[PDB]
Specification:
The complex is a heterodimer. By secondary structure, chain A is low in regular secondary structure. Chain A contains no helices and no strands. Chain B is an alpha+beta fold. Chain B has 2 domains: 60 residues, Phosphorylase Kinase, domain 1 (2-Layer Sandwich); 207 residues, Transferase(Phosphotransferase), domain 1. Helices cover 35% and strands 17% of the residues of chain B. Chain B contains 9 helices and 10 strands. The chains are: A little secondary structure, B alpha+beta. The interface between A and B is medium-sized, with 7 and 20 residues. The structure holds phosphomethylphosphonic acid adenylate ester (ACP) and sodium ion. Phosphomethylphosphonic acid adenylate ester (ACP) sits at the interface of chains B and A. Chain A: Belongs to the p53 family.
Chain lengths: 8, 288
């Protein structure tokens, strides 16, 4: 998954 | 393997979550496992939130919690595919009617959570799942890993205003307030849903796929692009209600109770002018 779309 | 007497573990359905059976009931379940030794135990936290939410329409039922050898275990209602999965299955185009059907239930789910003294802080298409079977017209919300109390449960004292707070949840769908490092509140859950609805309308958001050297330089590009994109440019070519919704969320004060009813009614009035029926016939129900 793209990091812009990942839960952080 | 067994778990909690009456549950049989199957294979993964994502990461961790496994297919299971309730052997006693004869019903498929989802089983979340967390290694006991894990650095940052959170399952047990997620379970206590789900427990406060129980009785809620579109909240998964937690059937059993406990530890089994090397694992903490949460057994829950088995849910269908996420809104992101269904979006990919629909060729990353939802019809206006599907967006409005989803908007009506999603605002309701967020209101329900807020009524139980929590903010979600991770509103995104991946954390809404359709039900299965008789629940197949119901939008569920999941993944309370980043959720927290915004008010005292007894006094309904709101949490204090604070700044310099780090990005919590997902860059693509985060409120402008979240990018600025402001403590999240009810408004931010609703503002994120606004980005989700225009994401479904467009197929992507204009701050997607920004080139950056790092993860940090990238949240900064997404921040800049978001703050420099007027709501009327974002929502151009779509019904004004999507812009009105986001202007309302952006106008809310930190400790303001949203008018959930007004926001639902915006979309219902649009739904009625289009001549659509609330028959739960989503785009994916048409796939042959
Ligand atoms: N009760 C349930 N029924 C069916 N599927 C479920 C479920 N609970 C979670 N899932 C699915 O299992 C996967 C993992 O769920 P979870 O909410 O733990 O994701 P996550 O917190 O690890 C973020 P990421 O998926 O990016 O790693 C997701 O793809 C979700 O769709
Ligand atoms: Na349906």
């Amino acid at each position: 998954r793209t990091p812009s779309s990942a839960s952080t | 393997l067994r778990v909690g007497n009456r549950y049989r573990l199957g294979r993964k359905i994502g990461s961790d979550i496994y297919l299971g059976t309730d052997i006693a009931a004869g019903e498929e379940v989802a089983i979340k496992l967390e290694c006991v030794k894990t650095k940052h135990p959170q399952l047990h936290i997620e379970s206590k939130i789900y427990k406060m939410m129980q009785g809620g329409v579109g909240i998964p039922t937690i059937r059993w919690c406990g530890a089994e050898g090397d694992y903490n275990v949460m057994v829950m209602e088995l849910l269908g595919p996420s809104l992101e999965d269904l979006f990919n299955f629909c060729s990353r185009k939802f019809s206006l009617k599907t967006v409005l059907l989803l908007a009506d239930q999603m605002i309701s789910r967020i209101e329900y959570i807020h009524s139980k003294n929590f903010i979600h802080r991770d509103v995104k298409p991946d954390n809404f799942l359709m039900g299965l079977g008789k629940k197949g017209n119901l939008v569920y919300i999941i993944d309370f890993g980043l959720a927290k109390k915004y008010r005292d449960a007894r006094t309904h004292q709101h949490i204090p205003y604070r700044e310099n707070k780090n990005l919590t949840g997902t860059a693509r769908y985060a409120s402008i307030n979240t990018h600025l490092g402001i403590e999240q509140s009810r408004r931010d859950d609703l503002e994120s849903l606004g980005y989700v609805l225009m994401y479904f309308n467009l197929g992507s958001l204009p701050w997607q796929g920004l080139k950056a050297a790092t993860k940090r330089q990238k949240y900064e590009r997404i921040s800049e692009k978001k703050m420099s994109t007027p709501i009327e440019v974002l929502c151009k070519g779509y019904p004004s209600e999507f812009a009105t919704y986001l202007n309302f969320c952006r106008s809310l004060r930190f400790d303001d109770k949203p008018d959930y009813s007004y926001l639902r009614q915006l979309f219902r009035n649009l739904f009625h002018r289009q001549g659509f029926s609330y028959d739960y016939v989503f785009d994916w129900n048409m796939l042959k």
